[PDB]
Structure formats: C-alpha cells, structure tokens
Ligand binder design. Structure first.
Ligand code: HEC
Length: 99
C-alpha cells in the first residue's frame, strides 16, 4: 500500500536480481505477471511465501527461514517488511512494471 516505502525496500533487497521486475539469474522466473502465473505464484500470499522461504537459487529472507544455506546470509527481513514487499511486487506486476 505504501508504494514509496515498498519501492525503497525493493530497490535495496531485491532489485539487483529482479531489475525492473526481471530476473538476471534465471530467465523465465521474473516478477512479470506471465511468469508469476506460469510458476503458480501470482498472488500476494505466494509471493510472500517464496520471499520468506526461498526457492532454488533465490535465498529466503524470513526470520524463520531454514536451513541456513537456503536463506540469505545477510540480515533477515521482518514479517512486516516481507508483507510490504509482496504487496509491492503484486502491485507492480499488475501494472506491468512501469518505468
Ligand atoms: C538473487 C540473488 C535474488 C535476490 C536477491 C532475490 N531474488 Fe527473487 N528470485 C531469484 C531467482 C534465481 C528466482 C527463481 C527461483 C526458481 O528456482 O524458480 C527468484 C524468484 C522469485 C519470485 C518468483 C518469480 C517467478 O516464479 O516467476 C519472486 C516472487 C521473488 N523471487 C521475489 C523476490 C523478492 C521480493 C526479493 C527481495 C526481497 C527477491 N526475490 C530477491 C533471485 C533473487
């Protein structure tokens, strides 16, 4: 809901890999609606879950993400931050990642 706060957090925690909604590591697994839909995760609740726990080559960010090697070696994000990020991603995907 707070777009500017979500954008700021996204820019520092996510953008290097998901530049403008993309995926610089894994083609086909972007944050665009088409890929989110194909991968079964075009919802806020699914975006939150994958951000929290990770999946293959993406680290999880949740406080209770486990085991250690599947999660960020940087600081974990709080639930509220991951919720803001999931809402931001869903909103941006719905809008087509405006530039
Ligand atoms: C690189 C080190 C990444 C960072 C930092 C973040 N993500 Fe990521 N993400 C990355 C990869 C390699 C993948 C694909 C994983 C796979 O095996 O499928 C993803 C995937 C996502 C998805 C799902 C996209 C889809 O299925 O099309 C989402 C919703 C997602 N990532 C969100 C996300 C957020 C919110 C991040 C910051 C907190 C973030 N990612 C960081 C690589 C990387």
């Amino acid at each position: 809901l707070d777009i500017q706060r979500g954008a700021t957090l996204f820019n520092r925690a996510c953008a290097a890999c998901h530049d403008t909604g993309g995926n610089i590591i894994q083609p086909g697994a972007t944050l665009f609606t088409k890929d989110l839909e194909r991968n079964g995760v075009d919802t806020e609740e699914e975006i939150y879950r994958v951000t929290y726990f990770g999946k293959g080559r993406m680290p999880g960010f949740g406080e209770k993400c486990t085991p250690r090697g599947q999660c960020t070696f940087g600081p974990r994000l709080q639930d509220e931050e991951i919720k803001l990020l999931a809402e931001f991603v869903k909103f941006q995907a719905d809008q087509g990642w405006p530039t």
